[PDB]
């Protein structure tokens, strides 16, 4: 997955957890 | 960019390093038997083609200051102070042999002598004192132990503290604060330093830290001024590049 | 070819934006004691290198990876801290504040320079289409 | 992954004992370190204080 | 112990140092914000023609 | 072919 | 050659030694 | 779909 390219599949949703659980 | 910003930035960061060294020295202004760290800027010129115009600066610590420190009179027979250029020997954290100036010798319940939690080293190795006995330390390091209950006639020598002689150029402060022989000095003087019979110690006086206050103050003033100077150069370079970028238009 | 300049300058813009983002993240978290895993925040740095695979020496800029610095984490003495080790020392980020500020300013300046290059090349390509009326 | 945000949290409180003044009052009481007095909270619960 | 009262345990040195660090940390965040805002303008101007 | 573009490559370092 | 000109060979590597051997 | 743009979304929040 080269940045700036085009891919058929959507990008996965990013997450920023404050705690691992 | 113009890498002139990367010169003043280095000069500003090494100034903060010098300030961190000076502040560390100032924090230990009351540490018993402390050796202040010397800080000095050194210039490294970048070699290459064509015109040598860039010379960066780095903060280095050329050893420590060995100037004998202050002597506080505490009427305690275990606190000893060393003659100038003399070091006490203890067993380091990793079972090695290290040097110190802190004479705050403590006696454990089992009877072993310790300095800052490190065992004290004599000619016979670590020193073990008879349990719960009064200790007197002579001028040349001999240790006399009096067992409580028995008369003062019982006072007899037990062991001799190992006292070594080492200059500033031969010793290097390890990461735990204990001085150890440098490579060149170790190669010539051997692995273990032999006890010098000429070293005299004084019992009942504790050596303080040799952090000079006037030099510290002057160093902080100079560091602040140098940092501000580098910031003014950085601002000038940034302003120059911001207009120079206009040449690419049209 | 002027068209490849679009790719070159766009790659440069993206790389410098990534570098400025890394610098801003380092500046923000200069005093962070912990992360989600309980590990100290290590200063991040981008890796710049050219991208000229089809038989060229010059092709622009791309960020190969983001790497954490190997300089020594600052040890602060705090025995009551749950994150303190056996000796009571807590690890703190090795961020160089002056370095990150200079990185922010330099990244902004070179980003602006690449913006100007892109504008100039776009103007030249616009003027080309009027070749001979 | 280049963006790392920062959030400010309060990991508990500081339990180092504070200053002790001497008021000649028979009701003022101070506790030894790591010790707490027990009171009945507002919501019928159990609370600890210094 | 009866007849003594326990006060607060707020350390003034820690609070003063923390306040100084907070102020001089904000200023840096405000500088980065200004830098990004200045950067976005020319990128926006790139969209002309 | 490249490295960290900034502070971490424009400061003197001991050799490897 | 003179600074700013064109040469046929790369410039030598740039290194700044902290302490000379 | 979408949510509040700007400050509120690009700020860490408790999981829910």
């Amino acid at each position: 997955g080269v940045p700036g390219a085009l891919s058929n599949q959507p990008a996965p949703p990013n997450e920023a957890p404050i705690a691992t659980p | 960019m113009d890498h002139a910003i990367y010169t003043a930035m280095g000069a500003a960061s090494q100034t903060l390093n010098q300030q961190a060294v000076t502040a560390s020295n100032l924090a230990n202004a009351s540490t018993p038997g402390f050796r202040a760290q010397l800080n000095a800027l050194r210039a490294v010129p970048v070699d290459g083609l064509s015109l040598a115009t860039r010379t960066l600066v780095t903060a280095s610590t050329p050893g420590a200051d060995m100037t004998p420190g202050q002597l506080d009179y505490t009427s305690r027979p275990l606190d000893v102070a060393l003659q100038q250029d003399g070091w006490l020997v203890v067993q380091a954290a990793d079972g090695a042999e290290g040097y110190t100036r802190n004479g705050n010798i403590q006696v454990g319940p089992t009877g072993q002598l310790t300095i800052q939690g490190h065992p004290v080293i004599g000619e016979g190795g670590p020193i073990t004192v008879p349990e719960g006995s009064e200790i007197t330390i002579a001028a040349d390091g001999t240790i006399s132990a009096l067992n409580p209950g028995d008369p003062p006639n019982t006072v007899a020598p037990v062991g001799r503290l190992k006292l070594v002689k080492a200059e500033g150029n031969e010793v290097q402060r390890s990461d735990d604060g204990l001085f150890r022989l440098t490579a060149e000095a170790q190669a010539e003087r051997g692995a273990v330093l032999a006890a010098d019979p000429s070293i005299r110690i004084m019992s009942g006086v504790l050596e303080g830290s040799n952090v000079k206050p006037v030099e510290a103050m002057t160093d902080m003033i100079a560091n602040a001024r140098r940092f501000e100077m580098q910031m003014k150069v950085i601002t000038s370079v940034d302003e120059n590049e911001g207009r120079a970028n206009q040449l690419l238009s049209m | 070819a002027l068209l490849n300049i679009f790719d070159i300058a766009g790659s440069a813009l993206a790389a410098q934006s990534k570098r400025l983002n890394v610098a801003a993240s380092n500046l923000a978290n200069a005093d962070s004691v912990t992360g989600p895993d309980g590990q100290p925040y290590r200063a991040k740095q981008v890796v710049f290198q050219v991208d000229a695979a089809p038989g060229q020496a010059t092709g622009g800029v791309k960020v190969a990876s983001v790497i954490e610095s190997q300089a020594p984490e600052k040890l602060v003495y705090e025995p009551g801290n749950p994150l303190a080790d056996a000796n009571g020392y807590v690890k703190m980020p090795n961020v160089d504040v002056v370095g990150e500020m200079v990185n922010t300013m330099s990244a902004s300046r070179s980003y602006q320079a690449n913006i100007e290059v892109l504008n100039t090349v776009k103007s030249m390509m616009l003027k080309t289409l009027t070749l001979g009326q």
Side-chain angles (χ1 to χ4, degrees), chain A, chain B, chain C:
Chain A
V2 173
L6 297 175
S7 96
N8 165 307
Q9 24 179 334
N14 47 52
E15 44 187 0
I18 322 184
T20 39
Chain B
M1 281 266 278
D2 207 351
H3 305 289
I5 191 176
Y6 294 129
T7 298
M9 165 251 263
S13 188
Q14 304 318 87
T15 304
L16 283 172
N17 272 340
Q18 259 209 61
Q19 182 81 45
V21 164
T22 302
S24 168
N25 282 350
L26 280 189
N28 296 75
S30 36
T31 301
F34 179 68
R35 301 279 146 259
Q37 271 255 2
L38 303 170
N39 38 18
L41 288 181
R42 58 187 323 112
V44 309
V46 187
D47 284 334
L49 293 193
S50 176
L51 274 192
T53 63
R54 316 224 203 226
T55 305
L56 314 167
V57 50
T58 46
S60 71
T61 62
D65 173 350
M66 291 325 178
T67 300
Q70 2 175 59
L71 281 325
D72 159 3
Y73 181 64
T74 79
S75 97
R76 204 174 103 90
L78 289 160
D79 313 329
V80 288
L82 270 282
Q83 165 206 71
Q84 161 169 59
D85 249 20
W87 299 80
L88 273 153
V89 166
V90 291
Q91 186 139 73
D94 76 348
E97 178 207 299
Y99 311 133
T100 179
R101 305 281 309 251
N102 192 6
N104 195 333
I105 305 177
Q106 296 277 336
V107 168
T110 318
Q112 29 205 61
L113 298 206
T114 51
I115 291 186
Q116 320 196 23
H118 307 294
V120 181
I121 298 283
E123 301 136 10
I127 309 151
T128 300
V129 159
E131 311 166 310
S133 78
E134 288 77 72
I135 283 294
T136 279
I137 306 175
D140 82 332
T142 310
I143 274 183
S144 304
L146 208 170
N147 212 358
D150 309 306
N153 187 282
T154 307
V155 185
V158 178
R160 188 137 159 227
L161 316 174
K162 188 188 232 178
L163 318 161
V164 305
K165 224 203 73 175
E167 272 56 358
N169 41 55
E170 284 161 356
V171 296
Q172 159 158 9
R173 167 199 322 259
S174 85
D175 277 353
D176 62 304
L178 254 49
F179 285 89
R180 229 152 289 156
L181 280 175
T182 60
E184 21 184 299
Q186 204 203 331
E188 171 285 9
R189 231 151 157 196
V192 309
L193 257 183
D196 259 28
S198 89
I199 307 294
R200 280 185 321 118
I201 86 187
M202 255 209 197
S203 56
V205 298
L206 193 54
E207 171 145 0
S209 89
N210 56 346
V211 178
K212 315 257 161 215
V214 73
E215 298 135 52
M217 278 291 215
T218 283
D219 288 351
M220 321 205 277
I221 293 177
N223 287 338
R225 299 323 132 195
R226 180 148 30 79
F227 190 86
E228 293 180 356
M229 271 185 218
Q230 314 297 152
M231 280 322 296
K232 178 64 184 67
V233 152
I234 279 176
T235 285
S236 211
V237 163
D238 191 354
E239 197 158 356
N240 276 337
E241 169 108 7
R243 43 206 57 181
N245 274 351
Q246 263 154 30
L247 281 183
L248 302 164
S249 69
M250 268 86 79
Chain C
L2 295 179
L3 190 40
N4 211 7
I5 306 189
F6 270 102
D7 191 20
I8 292 171
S11 316
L13 288 179
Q16 303 266 301
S17 169
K18 292 175 185 176
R19 180 179 108 161
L20 164 67
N21 256 325
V22 153
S25 316
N26 279 13
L27 266 159
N29 310 6
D31 294 344
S32 308
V33 288
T34 188
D37 292 25
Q39 290 296 297
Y41 169 76
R42 274 171 211 71
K44 286 204 271 280
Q45 303 284 12
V46 278
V47 173
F48 271 25
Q49 46 172 79
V50 312
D51 72 349
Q56 294 206 170
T58 81
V61 169
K62 75 153 171 43
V63 171
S65 51
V66 181
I67 56 171
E68 291 185 359
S69 289
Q70 303 237 354
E73 281 158 18
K74 293 181 183 174
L75 260 53
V76 307
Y77 183 77
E78 178 124 13
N81 222 345
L83 316 168
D85 270 24
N87 304 347
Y89 281 106
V90 173
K91 303 185 214 178
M92 291 276 245
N94 42 354
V95 184
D96 186 14
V97 181
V98 188
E100 305 303 327
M101 301 265 298
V102 166
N103 270 17
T104 286
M105 308 197 316
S106 168
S108 297
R109 289 308 194 204
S110 283
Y111 182 93
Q112 286 166 20
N114 291 326
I115 293 297
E116 277 278 13
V117 181
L118 248 186
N119 238 351
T120 297
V121 165
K122 194 181 46 57
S123 278
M124 300 205 318
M125 260 185 167
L126 261 183
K127 204 142 171 303
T128 279
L129 295 171
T130 84
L131 178 54
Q133 302 289 350

